[PDB]
Amino acid sequence: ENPLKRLLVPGEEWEFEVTAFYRGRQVFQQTISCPEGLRLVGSEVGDRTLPGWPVTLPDPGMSLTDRGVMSYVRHVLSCLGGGLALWRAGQWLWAQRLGHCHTYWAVSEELLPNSGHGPDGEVPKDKEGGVFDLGPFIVDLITFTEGSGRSPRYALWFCVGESWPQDQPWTKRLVMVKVVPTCLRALVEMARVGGASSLENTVDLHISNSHPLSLTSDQYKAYLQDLVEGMDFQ
């Protein structure tokens, strides 16, 4: 069968890598696998009946050093309330704002949140909003393996409590959070090493109850095509 289809099995858990930046400085990183997805919080803890594994963004610390902008960070964190939920259902990633901080998002490069022609949207409150569709990603990944397109983007970036930094250095923003579904990072890496030859390379999908796959470039491309045939497109 097609081992890549495990990505879309109802009940399957993806691993998400969450990395937080205060003023362009990495302050936190955690990898989460949970049937409920994840929920970014500032530790106003907090309603435990809220959905999602709570991912606590750290207090900036009480140093005199940098006290000004860090007090702004602390204020934003203190207003996160219920926070920012992110979870998977089907071929989609969904987000929802459960607290008071307006949050904007984009699917971007690993290292650069904003370029990017502005944000892809604002995370909604009181209902879920789709932030990522695996379907077009796989189509673009197939194109990538054929030499005909760019590396497909999979890094979700959230700007918390401020406008999206369009045409501004992203490092000026108080609270920026990157979430990478690590299966997608692995799929892109696997595509890059595929053209090395027709020997076998290993790809670790980083999903629940899954084993590292050893595949030839042909096998991999074949599985991607089969995977995309069973996915939903409008």
Binding site: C79, H100, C101, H102, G161, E162, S163
Partner: peptide, 10 residues
């Protein structure tokens, strides 16, 4: 700096 926070009320 100048920070325009986008935080709603209760």
């Amino acid at each position: 700096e100048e920070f325009e926070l986008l935080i709603s009320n209760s």
